[PDB]
Design an enzyme around this catalytic site. Structure first.
Site, PDB file in Angstrom:
ATOM      1  N   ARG A 144      58.009  15.898   4.179  1.00 42.92           N
ATOM      2  CA  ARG A 144      57.624  15.453   2.813  1.00 42.92           C
ATOM      3  C   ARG A 144      58.778  15.615   1.822  1.00 42.92           C
ATOM      4  O   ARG A 144      59.388  16.693   1.801  1.00 42.92           O
ATOM      5  CB  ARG A 144      56.408  16.246   2.324  1.00 42.92           C
ATOM      6  CG  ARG A 144      56.152  16.152   0.829  1.00 42.92           C
ATOM      7  CD  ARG A 144      54.965  16.993   0.405  1.00 42.92           C
ATOM      8  NE  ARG A 144      54.847  17.088  -1.043  1.00 42.92           N
ATOM      9  CZ  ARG A 144      54.993  18.200  -1.754  1.00 42.92           C
ATOM     10  NH1 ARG A 144      55.249  19.348  -1.153  1.00 42.92           N
ATOM     11  NH2 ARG A 144      54.860  18.164  -3.067  1.00 42.92           N
TER      12      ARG A 144
ATOM     13  N   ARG B  48      51.163  17.369 -21.195  1.00 41.04           N
ATOM     14  CA  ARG B  48      51.627  18.583 -21.845  1.00 41.04           C
ATOM     15  C   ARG B  48      51.368  18.515 -23.349  1.00 41.04           C
ATOM     16  O   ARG B  48      51.329  17.438 -23.954  1.00 41.04           O
ATOM     17  CB  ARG B  48      53.133  18.828 -21.556  1.00 41.04           C
ATOM     18  CG  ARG B  48      53.396  19.656 -20.284  1.00 41.04           C
ATOM     19  CD  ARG B  48      54.872  19.718 -19.886  1.00 41.04           C
ATOM     20  NE  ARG B  48      55.350  18.477 -19.285  1.00 41.04           N
ATOM     21  CZ  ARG B  48      56.553  18.339 -18.734  1.00 41.04           C
ATOM     22  NH1 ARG B  48      57.380  19.380 -18.706  1.00 41.04           N
ATOM     23  NH2 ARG B  48      56.933  17.175 -18.207  1.00 41.04           N
TER      24      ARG B  48
ATOM     25  N   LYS C 126      45.668  11.518  -3.321  1.00 41.13           N
ATOM     26  CA  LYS C 126      45.524  12.953  -3.497  1.00 41.13           C
ATOM     27  C   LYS C 126      44.294  13.220  -4.345  1.00 41.13           C
ATOM     28  O   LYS C 126      44.231  12.804  -5.509  1.00 41.13           O
ATOM     29  CB  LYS C 126      46.759  13.551  -4.161  1.00 41.13           C
ATOM     30  CG  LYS C 126      47.864  13.953  -3.195  1.00 41.13           C
ATOM     31  CD  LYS C 126      49.223  14.095  -3.923  1.00 41.13           C
ATOM     32  CE  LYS C 126      49.244  15.358  -4.812  1.00 41.13           C
ATOM     33  NZ  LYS C 126      50.581  15.851  -5.278  1.00 41.13           N
TER      34      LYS C 126
ATOM     35  N   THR D 288      48.438  22.688   0.086  1.00 43.36           N
ATOM     36  CA  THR D 288      48.526  23.655  -1.051  1.00 43.36           C
ATOM     37  C   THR D 288      48.018  25.058  -0.709  1.00 43.36           C
ATOM     38  O   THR D 288      46.836  25.174  -0.328  1.00 43.36           O
ATOM     39  CB  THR D 288      48.058  23.092  -2.405  1.00 43.36           C
ATOM     40  OG1 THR D 288      46.633  23.066  -2.482  1.00 43.36           O
ATOM     41  CG2 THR D 288      48.641  21.733  -2.730  1.00 43.36           C
TER      42      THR D 288
END
Length: 474
Positions: free
Chosen positions: A35, A76, A217, A275
């Site tokens: 990856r 953000r 995802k 993860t």
């Protein structure tokens, strides 16, 4: 290549990897995919590592796929005049579009498409969910909030909105540049971030073309709700546990993960659990008991791939991280309960020829010691269907095409071999058989099974099967 484990291991490439020989060591320890994280590095590093991987693929001569991970949009908060404002519990706070430096009462949220469609009584998470904000009442320019959890809020900190589904494309302008660079490189797999609608797959697929396959995802509740739909429009699904854990109750997650692997195995699409697999390994040569359990659950659900990120990309022991992952998968496979375990999840076949052939394959496998299923395709889609059933015998997929083989590397227990198309089922019997002794899969006297399309054409479903025995090559 030795089929020590059937579950696949995708390993991230990063600063710690720094040799053409480093990649060879990772696959020599059972890594199947590689990856490239486009949230880090610069294109010279990716392009360098990509080539390094392609030397190893040619040297070992067995197809190893490359996956490129898009960063997605990053949400953000604006800047603070103080820089660090200490937000207090249960106090009213607002955020505008205007660039008013933060004053414990208002900061900006540069991205305004968040502001639209936010309803009162929705939660808002900042600093990786450390602080929870409750929206009391909204305007077009700003959102009035009540602090539901407090703490120091630095500027340019991260924002999450679990409740709302936003009209925003998972493709950032930065992601589009990444897409044009990876497609030029010849990546096989593109992982898409921030998927919240099944329509978000279509936009990415149109840019991707038939050049590469796409993996969605699952990172938002928005997607988990519509998982069934999203799983249909894409080629594979990756679960970013860590990233949901922000947007949902932790206790909820392993259920979601468990559910999603089922949805994927119904549709036969490859499922990747990713993860926080073995983070302890970044700095330590052995994992924690808790981690091994976390892995073994994912492997045991029947999921096709497990992804190692920091442990290999930037870590003091990146090879042994893979060595362990493979050992844990072998331990789960070793368990006799695991073979029976998968049986319940196995969806009963639908009334089609391709399902029946795969079903017949099961019976023949109980009656005879079948060393290899040998389905042959170019489009991959058949070997995907042969893998849905999760056979105890390893699949040896035969390929008239490198692109499909590299994609098939993610698939459960599928080992791909590439040769010139021979175009005929009854002829390829010897070839498929010889290939097996070639890949050193079957001994003289084992029985193998071959399946393929009927006219060796684009008509679908691969509807014939044929048992063959490897009589002594005296």
């Amino acid at each position: 290549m030795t089929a020590d484990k059937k579950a696949k291991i995708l390993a991230t490439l990063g600063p710690a990897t720094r040799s053409r020989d480093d990649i060879r060591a990772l696959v020599e320890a059972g890594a199947n995919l590689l990856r490239l994280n486009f949230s880090h590095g610069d294109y010279a590093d990716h392009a360098q590592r990509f080539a390094w991987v392609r030397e190893v693929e040619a040297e070992l001569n067995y197809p190893i796929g490359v996956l490129m991970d898009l960063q997605g949009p990053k949400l953000r908060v604006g800047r603070f005049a103080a820089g660090a404002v200490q937000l207090q519990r249960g106090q009213t706070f607002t955020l505008d579009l205007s660039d008013a430096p933060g004053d414990e009462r208002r900061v900006n949220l540069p991205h305004p498409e968040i502001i639209h469609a936010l309803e009162p009584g929705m939660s808002l998470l900042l600093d990786d969910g450390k602080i929870r904000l409750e929206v009391v009442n909204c305007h077009s320019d700003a959102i009035e909030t009540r602090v539901a959890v407090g703490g120091e809020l630095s500027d340019r900190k991260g924002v999450n909105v679990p409740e709302a589904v936003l009209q925003l494309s998972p493709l950032t302008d930065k992601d589009r540049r990444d897409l044009a660079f990876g497609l030029e490189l010849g990546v096989d797999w593109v992982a898409l971030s921030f998927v919240q609608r099944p329509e978000d797959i279509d936009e990415a697929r149109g840019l991707i073309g038939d050049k590469a396959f796409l993996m969605a995802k699952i990172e938002k509740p928005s997607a988990v709700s519509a998982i069934e739909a999203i799983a249909e429009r894409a080629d594979a699904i990756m679960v970013a546990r860590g990233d949901l854990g922000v947007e949902v109750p932790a206790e909820s997650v392993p259920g979601i993960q468990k559910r999603i692997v089922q949805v994927c195995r119904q549709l036969g699409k490859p499922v990747v659990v990713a993860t926080q697999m073995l983070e302890s390994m970044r700095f330590s040569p052995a994992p924690t008991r808790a981690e091994v359990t976390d892995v073994a659950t994912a492997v045991g659900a029947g999921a096709d791939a497990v992804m190692l990120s920091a442990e290999t990309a930037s870590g003091q022991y990146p090879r042994e991280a893979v060595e362990m992952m493979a050992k844990i998968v072998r331990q789960v496979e070793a368990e006799p309960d695991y073979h029976v375990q998968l049986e319940v999840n196995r969806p009963q076949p639908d009334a089609t020829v391709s399902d029946a052939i795969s079903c017949a394959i099961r019976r023949v496998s109980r009656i005879l010691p079948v060393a290899v299923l040998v389905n042959y395709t170019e489009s991959g889609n058949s070997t995907l269907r042969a893998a849905r059933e999760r056979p105890k015998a390893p699949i040896l997929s035969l390929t008239p095409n490198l692109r499909t083989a590299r994609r098939l590397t993610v698939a459960w227990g599928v080992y791909s071999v590439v040769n010139e198309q021979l175009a005929h089922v009854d002829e390829i019997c010897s070839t498929a058989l010889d290939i097996a002794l070639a890949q050193r899969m079957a001994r003289r006297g084992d029985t193998v099974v071959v399946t393929a399309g009927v006219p060796f054409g684009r008509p679908g479903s691969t509807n014939m099967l044929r048992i063959e025995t490897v009589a002594p090559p005296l």
